Write a protein that binds this ligand. Structure first.
Ligand SMILES: COc1ccc(CCN2CCC(Nc3nc4ccccc4n3Cc3ccc(F)cc3)CC2)cc1
Length: 365
């Protein structure tokens, strides 16, 4: 048996009855402050608090003025200067909105992607750098302090189809992206070119020059493979220097570029080998856009499937690809679980569903 046990303590359904596509705990809150997570779906962004006796306390909602916006994803950050939390959301309109979670009002917004945005990620060491991933086949790195587009990752050897997912490594030196073209691509952002681009993006003063700020066009990833999956890749995360990624073949694959002994930071762009370490098998999760998540210290891996089962794997264990997961089911939870989120201390796991239901699972302590 997996050593991580959870009990379902609460559930609720949102009034709009549309699929909830994203859920994110805020990992930037004080160990003293209450645990807060956001859900997104329809034209709605909703905040909830977790409290004693399994309560899920509704805090506040944001409804977009555009009735036909469809939010797919959200990401937390904080303002460098005020230390106050900020929430980025985006979806089918390709517009990035920054919401003030205290007032739940839109502060500013970025247009630019020519199509839907499927994922948002904030740099783990610079909270002002937001990465967006788009159906126009590109990734974009924004500086939301100076409202500038730093770089566009796409072109000659960028993705050939819609990009679905991306993730920064531990320190934010590199990005792995993936999408409908079956490929996984690595983009290093600690190169001198990207370092200078990031620095220039901070020095940009509009009321001090008339020349617009030109984004760096990054056309060549630092590594690319289509040898991991045989179909689209709808989720990728770094596991240390290893990569976890999934397609619609009912497995998360753990792999790394190069040969097994090869250091990630010496992989050249022309590297043709990958090493598959193993896979996490499951069933009934072969529909498009089902995301997996890990806890802060990457001791646990969670994936929901299309009939409401929630798998949790212990990542600390020997022979982890052959170990049985914990399967969490509730007889009232039958809809597809789109994304899950662990609280900062791994005490809570929240799942959100295609029928607008939210499920709260508490780790037995
Ligand atoms: C917020 O800051 C932090 C700081 C640290 C961390 C932990 C990173 N973690 C990353 C994974 C590490 N395992 C690990 N590397 C390996 C390298 C080669 C071969 C096997 C390896 N295996 C074992 C393994 C392989 C596959 C698998 F599916 C499970 C285990 C162990 C360390 C998280 C957040």
């Amino acid at each position: 048996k997996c050593k991580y046990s959870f009990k379902c303590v609460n559930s609720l359904k949102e009034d709009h009855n549309q699929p909830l596509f994203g859920v994110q705990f805020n990992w930037h809150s004080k160990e003293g402050d209450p645990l807060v997570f956001a859900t997104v779906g329809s034209n709605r962004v909703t905040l909830y608090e977790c409290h004693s006796q399994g309560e899920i306390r509704l805090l506040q909602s944001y409804v977009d003025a555009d009735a036909d916006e469809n939010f797919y994803t959200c990401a937390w950050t904080y303002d460098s200067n005020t230390s106050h939390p900020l929430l980025a959301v985006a979806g089918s309109r390709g517009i990035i909105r920054i919401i003030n979670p205290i007032t739940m009002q839109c502060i500013k917004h970025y247009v630019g992607h020519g199509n839907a945005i499927n994922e948002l990620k904030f740099h783990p060491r610079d909270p002002n750098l937001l990465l967006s991933v788009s159906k126009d086949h590109a990734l974009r790195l924004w500086n939301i302090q100076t409202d500038t587009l730093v770089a566009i990752f796409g072109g000659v050897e960028g993705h050939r189809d819609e990009v679905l997912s991306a993730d920064y490594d531990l320190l934010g030196e590199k990005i792995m992206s993936c999408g409908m073209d079956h490929s996984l691509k690595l983009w290093r952002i600690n190169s001198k070119r990207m370092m200078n681009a990031i620095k220039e993006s901070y020095d940009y003063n509009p009321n001090k020059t008339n020349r617009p700020f030109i984004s760096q066009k990054i056309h060549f990833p630092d590594f690319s493979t289509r040898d991991i999956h045989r179909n689209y890749v709808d989720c990728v995360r770094w596991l240390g220097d290893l990569i976890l990624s999934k397609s619609c073949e009912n497995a998360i694959v753990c792999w790394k570029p190069g040969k097994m002994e090869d250091d990630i930071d010496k992989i050249k762009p022309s590297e043709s080998n990958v090493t598959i370490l193993g896979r996490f098998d499951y069933s009934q999760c072969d529909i498009w856009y089902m995301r997996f998540s890990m806890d802060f210290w990457q001791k646990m891996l969670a994936l929901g499937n299309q009939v409401g089962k929630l798998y949790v794997w212990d990542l600390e264990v020997e022979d982890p690809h052959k170990a049985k997961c914990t399967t969490l089911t509730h007889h009232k939870c039958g809809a597809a679980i789109r994304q899950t989120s662990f609280s900062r201390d791994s005490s809570i796991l929240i799942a959100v569903c295609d029928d607008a239901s939210i499920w709260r699972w508490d780790r037995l302590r």
